């Protein structure tokens, strides 16, 4: 649900 995915 947290849209702040790690772009790595």
């Amino acid at each position, epitope marked *: *649900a*947290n*849209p*702040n*995915a*790690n*772009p790595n």
Partner: antibody
Amino acid sequence: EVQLLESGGGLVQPGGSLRLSCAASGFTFSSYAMSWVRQAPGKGLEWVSAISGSGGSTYYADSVKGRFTISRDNSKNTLYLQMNSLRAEDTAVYYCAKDPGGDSSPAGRTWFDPWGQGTLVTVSS
Amino acid sequence: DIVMTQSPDSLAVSLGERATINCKSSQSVLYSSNNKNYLAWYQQKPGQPPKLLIYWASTRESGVPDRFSGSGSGTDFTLTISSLQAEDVAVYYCQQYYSTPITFGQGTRLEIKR
């Protein structure tokens, strides 16, 4: 409402130690990564340290690595920053700041809202 | 580390006019998987903590007046304040959260011309 309140700042001798605290209210504390961000007088913003919601992960800026330790008590809604071997250049207002969305990875890789009012740390003899 | 550079460092703008502040990242903060720009903007008034204005480069935080808007993509971003009000005197900061350590721009001091 979500609120953060820092305490513990004060005058410290160079080489000395201080512990900062940040009391959180108004949200499920352990669901959110928390960070410390500091601002030297008249200067900009420098991220210092972050901790995951569970406390299982901690990260530090190179400028404080080996001297500062971040921790949290998820039974007391409190975040801590233990500062050892303090230097003149550590003089700053220290802010507690919350991950607005949750427990982003790595802890501290986020924008911040809200921020506390800050606590002033002065390192001087 | 990603370096954030704001342009200009300071500017003076009269009430009711539009102020524009630019922010450049030293590498792109656009994630191709979700097409999001990992960029935020803050306002800091004297004696106060920074206050969030914009995140994901263009999403306005709840409660922020709609005269504040963010735009841009990749490495080049802009904060625009329309219809400037007297209380908008502040230092404005951009920040990337694409990679750690997170980093801030150096700040742009907005003066009100009168």
